[model samples]
Target: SKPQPIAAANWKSGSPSLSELIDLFNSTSINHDVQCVVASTFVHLAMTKERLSHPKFVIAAQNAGNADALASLKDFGVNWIVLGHSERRWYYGETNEIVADKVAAAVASGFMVIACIGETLQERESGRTAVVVLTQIAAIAKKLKKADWAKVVIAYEPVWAIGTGKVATPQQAQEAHALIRSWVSSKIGADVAGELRILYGGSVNGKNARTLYQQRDVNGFLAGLKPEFVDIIKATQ
Candidate 1:
């Protein structure tokens, strides 16, 4: 069976105010079939716990701290981590090695991890998408055994599309997601690959999510919108 579909909101920095996001969450009817994750900025974490109480909507943070660096978050009620995003990799100069360390530590710290990997526009221009993403994943895989993968979700967000008013066509996402599954099967085991959840991201909107979710390997999404996010979460197989 496929993993449960998860729609994640990666609110990088402040765009919509937290109160507005809370209002949006309360206004919409969440789809039980889909698991929704809100990867809010670090500051909004506590208020979300008090506001969005729905079980289906998992609260997440966009960055990962060391097990001890942010050890207190466990008690604060933030359970999921969205690590290795493009901004962190490109602007902040996070290498695959650094991201791997973060992924390993985040999982060890008892938080589920959404580890991101993707090809930047230049890399894609040179037709090195597979070469780039696989390198990133390989670094992460080397640090974690098959058992550790159970706590991880792979999110494939093309660097060119993120916040750039661009998106991978449904076909592009399926092909890329398929590549990741194949890599996992070869590097780890078929059983582990079959169980992993690979989410698509970058400029995904409510309109395209329906068709995008139809792709066999496209398990869910990592969205970047506020009001339209409800529509993204409502997408089905």
Candidate 2:
């Protein structure tokens, strides 16, 4: 069966202003189908809750560590939260244990979690990509109930490709994505894994999204850059 694609736009804190992004989303003809992940402070959540409408504008808190923050957003209509983003785990100090805790907390608060997992360049070069990714997922699995896994969106972002302008070969991405799905099926269950939406992040653009979408396990993407390139949006649309 062909996988259905669910696209998301990630706005880091303070980079693209909310109004600017809302304008961009409004301009896109496929706005209704796309989900936007806004990565900002609590204020962004408050602002967006008052601004954007339901279902069409699902809000995602950037890097929420506090459980109250996650719960508050859900109360205000923000249903999604981005957890364990590669940059947050690498640059800041988010460990696998921390990510698992965050995932548990978000789910407890009735928020859908976007749990990110990836292999660093050194790990990939050392032929440990599959093990690294699986280990991370396994840690989170311990925290979540089988039913709760349905609310988690696992985004596999290769550390080597993010912001380096280096893109993974299509075969490379498909192989990694397939392995991720297999790992989920083994640790969780085939039913839960089937329901999970695995998105490929890192260096994704118009040129590769179509091919990436063609892969069986890659259900969508988390774009790090612009949200409104007409051509890029059209391909995913």
Candidate 3:
């Protein structure tokens, strides 16, 4: 089977009315190979409740709070959780170790983990992008067993590009993604590395989504909130 393309809408603080968004998603028919997830604030997760009955769409938490919180989210019908998002790391001081702990707990609780890793503008300019990302992944890799990796999806969101309207060119994104896969292969093996999904998350929009998705290593996208998010998903097909 071809790897399923993930189209994740990270509805940070600004968001549409979740009820309307979920209604639109459930009513529309997306490509069978695409997996859609709406990562909403904890308060709005309930708005996606009705859409979970079908597999075309599912809800994900923007960030997991703790072990008990992870349990609550699973009980609430959320099977996917976003961890190590740049915002969590920069604003909340969530170090790689902290993110790794969350990944371990989330995976152990049976939730799919969209683990994010990236470099800031300074880090990138300093020529440490690869080092920064590898450090982040190394921490999580230690916490997860080889088998636990099957539930992991890596999202590369450069902190500088995240919400700055500056997207990484396809070549840059591919290079970073390829490096990530190579690192994973070294830690695990080639077979598992080939199966991992590395998503590009930055200032992704419909205008550039198709081109970025065309990259060999970019399996899909972790999109910011936008009216064109639906269009981005369509482009994947």
TM-score of each: 0.95, 0.89, 0.94
Model 2, 50-166: lDDT tens digits are 555544446678677787777667777778888898877888888999999989998988888888899999999999998899999988999989989868888889999888978
Error of 3 at 176 (Å): 0.4
**Model 2 TM-score (2 dp):** 0.89
- Of 1 and 2, the candidate ahead on lDDT is 1
Which residue segments of model 2 deviate by more than 4 Å?
Answer: 2-4, 17-21, 31-36, 47-55, 229-233
Backbone clashes in candidate 3 total 0
Model 3 agreement with the true structure over 113-196: per-residue lDDT tens digits:
999999999999999999999999999999999999889999999998987999999999999999999999998998889889
Count backbone overlaps in model 2. 1
Q: Which residue pairs of candidate 3 clash?
A: none
RMSD of each: 1.5, 2.4, 1.6
lDDT against the true structure, per candidate, is 0.87, 0.76, 0.86
